[PDB]
Amino acid sequence: ASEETLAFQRQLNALIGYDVTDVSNVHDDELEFTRRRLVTPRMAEVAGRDPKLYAMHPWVTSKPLPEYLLKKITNNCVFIVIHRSTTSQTIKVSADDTPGTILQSFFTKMAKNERDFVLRVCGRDEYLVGETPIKNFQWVRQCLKNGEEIHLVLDTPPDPALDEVRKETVSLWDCDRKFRVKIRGIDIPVLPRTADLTVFVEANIQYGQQVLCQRRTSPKPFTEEVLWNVWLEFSIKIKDLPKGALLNLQIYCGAKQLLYYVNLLLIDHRFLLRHGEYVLHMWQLSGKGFNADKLTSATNPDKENSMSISILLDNYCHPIALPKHRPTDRVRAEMPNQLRKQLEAIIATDPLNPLTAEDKELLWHFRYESLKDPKAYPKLFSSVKWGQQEIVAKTYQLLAKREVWDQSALDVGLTMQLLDCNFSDENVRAIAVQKLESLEDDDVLHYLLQLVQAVKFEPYHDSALARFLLKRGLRNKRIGHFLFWFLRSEIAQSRHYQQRFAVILEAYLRGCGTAMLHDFTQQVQVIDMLQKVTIDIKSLSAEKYDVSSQVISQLKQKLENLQNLNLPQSFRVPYDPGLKAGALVIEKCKVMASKKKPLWLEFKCADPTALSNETIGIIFKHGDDLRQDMLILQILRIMESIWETESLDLCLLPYGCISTGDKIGMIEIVKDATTIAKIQQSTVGNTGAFKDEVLSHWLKEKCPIEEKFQAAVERFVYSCAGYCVATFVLGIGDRHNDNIMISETGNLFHIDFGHINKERVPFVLTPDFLFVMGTSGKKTSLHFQKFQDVCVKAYLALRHHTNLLIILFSMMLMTGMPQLTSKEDIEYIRDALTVGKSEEDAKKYFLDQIEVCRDKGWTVQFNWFLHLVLGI
Numbered sequence: 001a002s003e004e005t006l007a008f009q010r011q012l013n014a015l016i017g018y019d020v021t022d023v024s025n026v027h028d029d030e031l032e033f034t035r036r037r038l039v040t041p042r043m044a045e046v047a048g049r050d051p052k053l054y055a056m057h058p059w060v061t062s063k064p065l066p067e068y069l070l071k072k073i074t075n076n077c078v079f080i081v082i083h084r085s086t087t088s089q090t091i092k093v094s095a096d097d098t099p100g101t102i103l104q105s106f107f108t109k110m111a112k113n114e115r116d117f118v119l120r121v122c123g124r125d126e127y128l129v130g131e132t133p134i135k136n137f138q139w140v141r142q143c144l145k146n147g148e149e150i151h152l153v154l155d156t157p158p159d160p161a162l163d164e165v166r167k168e169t170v171s172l173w174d175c176d177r178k179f180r181v182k183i184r185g186i187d188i189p190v191l192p193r194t195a196d197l198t199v200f201v202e203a204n205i206q207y208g209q210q211v212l213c214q215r216r217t218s219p220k221p222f223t224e225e226v227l228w229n230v231w232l233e234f235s236i237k238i239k240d241l242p243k244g245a246l247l248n249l250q251i252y253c254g255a256k257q258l259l260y261y262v263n264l265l266l267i268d269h270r271f272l273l274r275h276g277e278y279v280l281h282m283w284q285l286s287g288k289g290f291n292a293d294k295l296t297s298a299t300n301p302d303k304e305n306s307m308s309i310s311i312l313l314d315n316y317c318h319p320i321a322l323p324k325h326r327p328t329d330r331v332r333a334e335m336p337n338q339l340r341k342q343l344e345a346i347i348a349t350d351p352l353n354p355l356t357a358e359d360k361e362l363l364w365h366f367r368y369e370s371l372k373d374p375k376a377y378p379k380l381f382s383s384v385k386w387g388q389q390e391i392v393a394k395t396y397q398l399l400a401k402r403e404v405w406d407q408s409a410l411d412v413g414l415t416m417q418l419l420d421c422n423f424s425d426e427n428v429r430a431i432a433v434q435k436l437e438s439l440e441d442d443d444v445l446h447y448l449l450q451l452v453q454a455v456k457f458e459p460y461h462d463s464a465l466a467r468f469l470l471k472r473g474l475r476n477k478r479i480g481h482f483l484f485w486f487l488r489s490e491i492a493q494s495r496h497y498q499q500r501f502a503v504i505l506e507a508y509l510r511g512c513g514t515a516m517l518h519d520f521t522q523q524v525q526v527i528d529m530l531q532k533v534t535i536d537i538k539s540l541s542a543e544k545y546d547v548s549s550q551v552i553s554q555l556k557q558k559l560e561n562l563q564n565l566n567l568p569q570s571f572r573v574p575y576d577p578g579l580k581a582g583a584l585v586i587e588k589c590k591v592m593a594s595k596k597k598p599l600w601l602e603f604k605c606a607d608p609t610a611l612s613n614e615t616i617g618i619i620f621k622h623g624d625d626l627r628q629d630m631l632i633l634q635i636l637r638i639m640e641s642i643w644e645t646e647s648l649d650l651c652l653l654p655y656g657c658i659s660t661g662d663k664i665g666m667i668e669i670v671k672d673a674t675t676i677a678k679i680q681q682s683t684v685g686n687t688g689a690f691k692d693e694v695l696s697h698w699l700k701e702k703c704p705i706e707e708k709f710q711a712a713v714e715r716f717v718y719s720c721a722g723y724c725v726a727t728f729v730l731g732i733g734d735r736h737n738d739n740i741m742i743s744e745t746g747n748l749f750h751i752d753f754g755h756i757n758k759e760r761v762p763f764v765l766t767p768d769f770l771f772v773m774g775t776s777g778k779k780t781s782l783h784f785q786k787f788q789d790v791c792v793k794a795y796l797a798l799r800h801h802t803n804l805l806i807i808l809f810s811m812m813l814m815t816g817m818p819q820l821t822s823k824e825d826i827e828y829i830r831d832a833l834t835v836g837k838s839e840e841d842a843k844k845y846f847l848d849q850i851e852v853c854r855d856k857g858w859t860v861q862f863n864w865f866l867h868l869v870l871g872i
């Protein structure tokens, strides 16, 4: 290992934010083993990607043009403005022309080596190239909807050389003996403050979040060291242990409640049975009383303060689990009319609905019949007795013939269901991933965060899903960019999965290319520098007192030093990679008058071809985990895409928001916007006597032109409806006025989500909102009626994708929540979506929620004010 190799590893660890070679918190070589195994997948993808297309990362879609965009185009034509220097001409092209047919058509119009130029969006690293109709480019579709013009510049294609990549005994199943483990003792440096506590150890053999067998030790006084030296034998036979099963060890604390836990994979990555002595440091349960963290094979790295449990496993030779080999029978394709019909009723049931013992027997007995319907796969494989060798073997025989599933249409919702906490079998999970291979880059982008979170449900570090993500990231820069940040936010805030995520990110970084490696370095530099600034200014972490003029002046000064000669002169915006930020506009920079004192920063665009002088407003938030906001915003983007397929535009505004490290992140500053509470405070003040006409007045004053005002109101009508529906389905509608913003164009949008007997409301639809829509009293109106229709429309449209939302919601709660979630928490979504109900009842249900808000008036906002502002 030369200084070079060591040096390279060093920088990668800096980009990752974790030392991927660290072995201070491992009891085996699974992680290192995974690093080695990911080497081939990475190299294979690197050598298979096109050097030019990878360099210009065209952002396209194969989806049809939405109904609301079809209107925007007159006669299959599109106008584009091409620039040179100041030199610029406007051309009219066909919506189906390829960027090549464009340039060739440009050289013929204006005329007085040759085709060595490329079309790039003005002021952005976004290229319109490749054999694709101009109308199938995301930027083109964006401009259309926004009504903005399409300005492209004629520059030289980026040399793909800049993406250069650096140089690169035997026992079988048979073991009729029952599995057993010995609990030696538990040890903890410091113990709780009640000192009359009792504790016992519970050992579970879990699979797919289900307990196959459980054993417990007797209760003993809770002291720094508690020894048992007792053997716990389980009712399951060694030969019946399925690959991916875990020995879940938990400690309960009572008086004389789960408090500590740690897991250990029974069958390792090499198909060998786990044996030997083990000293495992456990995690402490925060929820005094469930989630992805409880399934981790990772141990707590903090040895000096955590609880550890010492156990002993059977130590003989080396029993190895034999990989299945499909031989072939009873397909039994016929059943009684009633039986058949009651089988289809079980399958037709929603995800959250539990299966009874009898329900599972029918599904399993008629496996092959159930196999004919993809939507039955989750229920079917959840009816498999995974704790039985014979049954599992039969399960693989069943999956052998997957022609029906192989030909089935890609159903993202259905696929995600097989990648959650309920399935630990590699074969079942692998078939879900098989289907994901069909997703085009644009769709991978919509579900990327969710897929990354799903890696937490994988029993092993190396899996089909982890490799899938690696591959798509290496194949497309935009996906690679976001993958980088999503993995980095987990590695920095999650000790439960940081080791596994670090291995996956290192594999991506060794194949993304020199150019991207340089971009990531600059972005990370700015974030590290900005973070230290928030750490150097000690008062920034003090919520007790307000922000003085001296601290702000101190902020401007420190930003000045950095900018002199140390801070990157330009970097890509984490949440908007196509945009390059340049120098800071120290004058407009400051410390927000917020309790959390976030940095309000403004930069200039580093791209000179930018057709504007507006700054890039970025909030550098510190002291807050922004992972939940990212999840909420992404689910909102998913709702947008869902509404797009149903041909609907709810005008949501999922602004940029990305966690960039440990309790730090960057948030997009929406231009020309203010808080609803702010608008109220200007007229009234620091009191709860809210006026109903303030909002409308504010909007009109911002839109003195007839046409403009009605355009804004219509926008308000849509955006208000979109958020009411969206926030209601997610169960986060009852919010304080200061968490809702509005732009001068009338766009309403919720912000600052954070970790989210009395008066309650389903969502925010206050008198000021109803006012803008021309409704004062309890009387209807033209705009309000529209509002009601749009709400119903968007609402029903979401129900058409119930299973998708249900699974997305359950995973989000399980992976993006500190505390433990229950079935009750997940079931909320099922009720909010009126599952089982007919469209009619559903339409009325939502309309009823709209009525609750009218009767409530300002009541709820007034209580929020009394609480949040007056501490009442």
Ligand SMILES: *c1oc2c3c1C(=O)O[C@H](COC)[C@]3(C)C1=C(C2=O)[C@@H]2CCC(=O)[C@@]2(C)C[C@H]1OC(C)=O
Residues within 6 Å of the ligand: 592, 594, 595, 596, 597, 598, 619, 621, 624, 655, 667, 668, 669, 670, 671, 673, 738, 739, 751, 752, 753
């Ligand atoms: C921490 O989520 C957000 C914010 C915070 C915070 O503590 O203060 C404010 C919100 O105060 C109610 C932050 C910085 C803001 C946003 C946010 O999501 C908004 C997202 C869209 C937008 O324009 C932002 C950046 C405004 C910003 O609020 C203010 C009052 O400047």
